[PDB]
């Protein structure tokens, strides 16, 4: 369970290549003498497949992923490879598929099996009367919540270790699409020593298991034969591939057996076969695909670092008003860049409420107002959503959904006089509460008791507009703070100023995606020789084709050049004559992609010969190709 085998030799996971492995039957449709294509999880030709061992010097049990599709090719001569382990993370946290073979039946159970660190099989008591009977079963630990159980036909498998070369080949195809498990199997006698053959074979399905679970990691089970860490294995090999959603050609005979497969993405010789949907291709030049240059960078330019709102003059002014008769400043037609206010290092009291400050820059609000006033330092907490006091209920009431900020700084040497500053006033008493964002400049005499005031003072008649008290020799927190309240509001009106334009630097002279303030698309920004107008934005062609752009505040005229595109024509010989092909793209050059430049494109794969011969394969512009010794 937790004890691992100490007979493991360290080896790096080297890779190898296959020739035509990974082709199976995609469906159960019987066809005769046709060549049709299909799109499924296939193993592409000349792929980097793994190179593992199943011997006693190097005994390794690696874990490979499963979500990308794998191909399982394994050679066997002494019945060492028995089954496999399927699961999500190789644990008993969920249901897992386990298909084992104890030489009697094919046990396929879907339970919550407790997988160990290194599960393996072993045969014990090889002294007298061995008979190759298994005794140690260390595959799983427990079983709970089973949903499927299948028992195959009983048989007898000889577990005797055979000597010599390989005798059997067991190649499997494992895939999982939307929980529907599919298993392909193939068995054929072979004669191998170390590696996989360079041949072709097809696979047939055996059973269908509609389980409905996801498999991400898997591990191959191996058996050992020892004559708990001194177990020795036999002699076997197994390769793990990687499936890709490719398209192959299926050459059907009169019996429906695939004899050869053609990849449409391996070599340009085989790409011509997928166009004509046949194996025998005559001498000539045919189109295979289309060339296209993918963009690698998005282009977003700026208009200028100017046209900013005066945050250094509004939020740093000298003359302000009172808390009840404050001056409301209108903010419109600017760029609300808050980069100079967050790291200004000049505000002793800087706090924001409501939401995150990163969300305020990515979300645009409608009403952006500034409420600046000078108050004392005892009731600064009352400027907050959900507060009570002489400011939030008598001077300046804030709504509960306040997402603004509070900006203040030390002004002990600016708004403080010796003897008391009586320039600003504040409301003390009121008959009731206020409204959110409400101005009250009334001079009504408050009546505390039952005695009427009649506009003048008297018994229980105090003046509500009292004066502030400022002192330079007062406390360090009771200094007058020039609090500038920034109001935020989101309504059905269109938003005006919340810093809309956020971009960066731009590149040019590449196949990129330009995105300006008035034109977007895809094109190469090359040099131009035209003459533009200072109020224009871009230019178009006759038949509605954008082919020119202009910088906002830079004297630079650029055109919209299309990238390298066009069809892919491959010159291919006959199937029984030669196999050398050339790469020829249309409407390109030999710089943006045996190299020669023609009028139709760049010809790569043909050596230029000054001798003029007979035109056998046409290319274009008086250039032809031939097959010389």
């Amino acid at each position, epitope marked *: 369970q937790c004890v691992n085998l100490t007979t493991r030799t360290q080896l790096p996971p080297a890779y190898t290549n296959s020739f035509t492995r990974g082709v199976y039957y995609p469906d159960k449709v019987f066809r005769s003498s046709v060549l049709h294509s299909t799109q499924d999880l296939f193993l592409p030709f000349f792929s980097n497949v793994t190179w593992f061992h199943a011997i006693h010097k190097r005994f390794d049990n690696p874990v490979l992923p499963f979500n990308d599709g794998v191909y399982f090719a394994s050679t066997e001569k002494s019945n060492i490879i028995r089954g496999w382990i399927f699961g999500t993370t190789l644990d008993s946290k969920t249901q897992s598929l386990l298909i084992v073979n104890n030489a009697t039946n094919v046990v396929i159970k879907v339970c919550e099996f407790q997988f160990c660190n290194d599960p393996f099989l072993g045969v014990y008591y090889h002294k007298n009367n061995k008979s190759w009977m298994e005794s140690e079963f260390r595959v799983y630990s427990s079983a709970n919540n089973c949903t499927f159980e299948y028992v195959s036909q009983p048989f007898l498998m000889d577990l005797e270790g055979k000597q010599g070369n390989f005798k059997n080949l067991r190649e499997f195809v494992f895939k999982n699409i939307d929980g529907y498990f599919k298993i392909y199997s193939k068995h054929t006698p072979i004669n191998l020593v170390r590696d996989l053959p360079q041949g072709f074979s097809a696979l047939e399905p055996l059973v269908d298991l509609p389980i409905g679970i996801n498999i991400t990691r898997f591990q191959t089970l191996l058996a050992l034969h020892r004559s708990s860490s001194g177990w020795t294995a036999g002699a076997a090999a197994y390769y793990v591939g990687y499936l890709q959603p490719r398209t192959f050609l299926l050459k059907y005979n009169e019996n429906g057996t695939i004899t050869d497969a053609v990849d449409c993405a391996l070599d340009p010789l085989s790409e011509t076969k997928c166009t004509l949907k046949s194996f025998t291709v005559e001498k000539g030049i045919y189109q295979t695909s289309n060339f296209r240059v993918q963009p690698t960078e998005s282009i977003v330019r700026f208009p200028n670092i100017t046209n900013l709102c005066p945050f250094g003059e509004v939020f740093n002014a000298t003359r302000f008003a009172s808390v009840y008769a404050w001056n409301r400043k209108r903010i419109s037609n600017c760029v609300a860049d808050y980069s100079v206010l967050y790291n*200004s*290092a000049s505000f002793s009291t*800087f*706090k924001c409420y409501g939401v995150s*400050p*990163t969300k305020l820059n990515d979300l645009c609000f409608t009403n952006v107002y500034a409420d600046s006033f000078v108050i004392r330092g005892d009731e*600064v*907490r009352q400027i907050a959503p959900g507060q009570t*006091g002489k400011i939030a209920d008598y001077n300046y009431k804030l709504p509960d959904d306040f997402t603004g900020c509070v900006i203040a700084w030390n002004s002990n040497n600016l708004d403080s006089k010796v003897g008391g500053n009586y320039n600003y006033l504040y409301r003390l008493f009121r008959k009731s509460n206020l409204k959110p964002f409400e101005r009250d400049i009334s001079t009504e005499i408050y009546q505390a008791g039952s005695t009427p005031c009649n506009g003048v003072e008297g018994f229980n008649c105090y003046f509500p507009l009292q004066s502030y008290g400022f002192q330079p020799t007062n406390g360090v*927190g009771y200094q007058p703070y020039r609090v500038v309240v920034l109001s935020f509001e989101l309504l059905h009106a269109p938003a005006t100023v919340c810093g809309p334009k956020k971009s960066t630097n731009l590149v040019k002279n590449k196949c990129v995606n330009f995105n300006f303030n008035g034109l977007t698309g895809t094109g190469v920004l090359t040099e131009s020789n035209k003459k533009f107008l200072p109020f224009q934005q871009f230019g178009r062609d006759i038949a509605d084709t954008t082919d020119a752009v202009r910088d906002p505040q830079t004297l630079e005229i650029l055109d919209i050049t299309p990238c390298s595109f066009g069809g892919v024509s491959v010159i291919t010989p006959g199937t029984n004559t030669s196999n050398q092909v050339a790469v020829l793209y249309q409407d390109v050059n030999c710089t943006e992609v045996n190299v020669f430049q023609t009028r139709a494109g760049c010809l790569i794969g043909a050596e230029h010969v000054n001798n003029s011969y007979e035109c056998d394969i046409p290319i274009g512009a008086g250039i032809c190709a031939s097959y010389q010794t």
Partner: antibody
Amino acid sequence: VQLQESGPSLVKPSQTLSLTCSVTGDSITNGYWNWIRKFPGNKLEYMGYISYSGSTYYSPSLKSRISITRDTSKNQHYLQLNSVTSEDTATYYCASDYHGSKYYFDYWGQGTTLTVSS
Amino acid sequence: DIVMTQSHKFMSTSVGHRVSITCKASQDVGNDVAWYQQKPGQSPKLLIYWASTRHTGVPDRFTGSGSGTDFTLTISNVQSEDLADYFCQQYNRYPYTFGGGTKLEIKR
């Protein structure tokens, strides 16, 4: 400048807390006086403050429960808590806040434990 | 109130290495970022005020920076006397809202 707490450690409910955190190292000339309790499990909560000039301002959560005074004669301060309950059992800390030479200074005490139980 | 949300509740470091405590505040406090220094068995003490000036008696091995919300206290050349619980808070106005808490562990 290091403060030191003093007083009883058992106060019955529906009574008045009477603690004393003295000041040693700096005379009462300019600064403030804070009082922050410490819940068991590394949790803090502000209670109130009072300036050295004679201005009182309390927290909006605990309006009539926080009553902190000052005494500039013996360089000591009193800590009173109105309407005590079982949830007020915490580690009380006394702190001060004063400025000087354009710098920010914040000193604390030593630590005391008060448990309210009937 | 200002909620000073932290990333981790306990961190460990060795003598001579560099440690960093990430405290992402949900509300904007600007450059007014304060830090504490709590010896075990004693009261906390002021360590870093206004995120750019150290306290009197503190060596220059404690640095700090940030922009908006991503505030990370950089502690280099950790010694045996650096055993303290660094707290992130704000000193804008009363009340002084404090954070959750991070306990530093010194390896030797």
